[PDB]
Amino acid sequence: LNTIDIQGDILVGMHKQKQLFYFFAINDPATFKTHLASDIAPVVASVTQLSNVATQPLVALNIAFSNTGLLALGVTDNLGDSLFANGQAKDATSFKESTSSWVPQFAGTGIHGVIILASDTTDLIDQQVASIESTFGSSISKLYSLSASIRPGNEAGHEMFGFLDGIAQPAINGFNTPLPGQNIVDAGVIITGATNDPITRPSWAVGGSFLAFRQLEQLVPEFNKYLLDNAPAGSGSLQARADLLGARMVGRWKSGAPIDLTPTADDPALGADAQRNNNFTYSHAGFDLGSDQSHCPFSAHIRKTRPRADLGGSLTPPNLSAGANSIMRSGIPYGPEVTSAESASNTTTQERGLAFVAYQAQLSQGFHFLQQTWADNANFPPGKTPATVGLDPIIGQNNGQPRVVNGLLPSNSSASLSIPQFVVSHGGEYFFSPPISAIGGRLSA
Ligand code: HEM
């Protein structure tokens, strides 16, 4: 790997308090290219730079292009990815959703790219945006944007449902020092043209990655109310038992504690411990892997998206199964905190959610595969008893309607729940984040 030439959000994440997703079209390739080379390319933050606190810019900038943006730039080379080429709108029906609920700018292929601006204040971001718009002039056009932020206080690093996020990533072999239980993968799973990437890419694409962007609204008061209404009977407060159900749905407690290691009560100390909070496989000493949902439901979100021992491999950490289906996640929450009024009425009045960002070298193996073949598949994971696992309670989709999810109730692993959508996709796009040398190189030529 040459982490000098790889955009930082791909392998490191921007790790700033604020981010802006600036979605643009290219009006005029010729003028746009000039300013791409002079104004954008030299300030794109790399993995190497973001990997050291002393070399992190006040504004971390990354930029990615859609198939039609690349077309607008006169670049027609085959990036080796049909899903990217066709755009996410065309792919929506693969996830049993429709472009009906999408931001209208996303329901098409008019968006040519996205600029990711990140800084610890919104002030610095808007300065950089004002400069970009000034210098590019009418060669660029803003079609849509989404402002996002780290949540405040003790919810920093947690997503809108309140769960600590950004714990689990694939370790890239030869680059990351793997953590206990962490999967270890070839660089080519995430970085196009890198080690063991079987797909031929254009020359200017080596060091890049596909960026799956999803604007995912979360119905937080509704979720909270559902958990309280369905809290399993037992010891502790109603909220504690409600939290237990929530944790069974995610596969982690709000603290980050993986339920597979903490199956009856939260242990917040575990969530804060990078050396132990991923050290599991779903295998347990005296339990049948195929039928035991006492530690973690077969349908739990993280078990659906990283099956670990459910797809074979070592029963002791680290489990190394399904390395090719790993994704890097750089998502960040958007929208305001939940208000008292919303909580009292258990009803959302304004949009908040996750600005979901997934990187992978193959869309068909990454985001698209986890959503369609695993999360939305009522019979995944395979070989379980009962065999009908049901859907991912967090992201599983059923054309807008309630999702049948099994195994969630600790007192009865055959008990089914009919769970309304908590996450409402408003769509997004598939982009390609090029290596930095390509931005001021071929893409500006
Ligand atoms: C609003 C929607 C979503 C929410 C609230 C959500 C929430 C979470 C949470 C709380 C975790 C645990 C933190 C961690 O392990 O790092 C997690 C992990 C993860 N999620 Fe999601 N997520 C969402 C969307 C998605 C989507 C759309 C995908 C893929 C299609 C996805 C794939 C993953 C993966 C791969 C992990 C790590 C699993 C592992 O390595 O064990 N998430 N998510």
Rg on CA atoms, Å:
21 Å
Q: How many strands, which pairing sense, and closed or not: the largest β-sheet?
A: 5 strands, antiparallel
The number of helical elements comes to 14
Structure classification? alpha+beta
Our estimate of the beta-strand percent is 15-25%
Q: Can you write the helix and strand succession as a string?
A: HEHHEHHHEHEEEEHHHHEEHEHEEEH
List each distinct ligand once. Answer: protoporphyrin IX containing FE
Number of domains: 1
Helix content: 10-25%
**Assembly annotation:** monomer
Number of strands: 13
Through-space gap between termini: 25 Å
What would the principal axes of the Cα set say about the shape? globular
PDB class: oxidoreductase
Keywords: decolorizing peroxidase (DYP), oxidoreductase, heme
Assembly: monomeric
Entry title: crystal structure of a decolorizing peroxidase (DYP) from auricularia auricula-judae
Topology (elements, then pairings):
Blueprint: H1 8-11, E1 18-26, H2 29-40, H3 47-50, E2 59-65, H4 67-72, H5 82-86, H6 88-91, E3 113-119, H7 122-136, E4 140-149, E5 171-172, E6 184-185, E7 209-218, H8 220-229, H9 238-250, H10 268-271, H11 301-305, E8 328-329, E9 332-334, H12 340-345, E10 353-360, H13 367-375, E11 403-406, E12 416-419, E13 423-433, H14 436-439
Parallel strand pairs: 5-6
Antiparallel strand pairs: 1-3, 1-4, 2-3, 7-10, 7-13, 8-10, 9-10, 11-12
Key attributes of the depicted protein:
445 residues, alpha+beta, five-stranded antiparallel sheet, four-stranded antiparallel sheet, 14 helices, 23% helix, globular, binds protoporphyrin IX containing FE, iron, metal ion binding, signal, DyP_N, glycoprotein
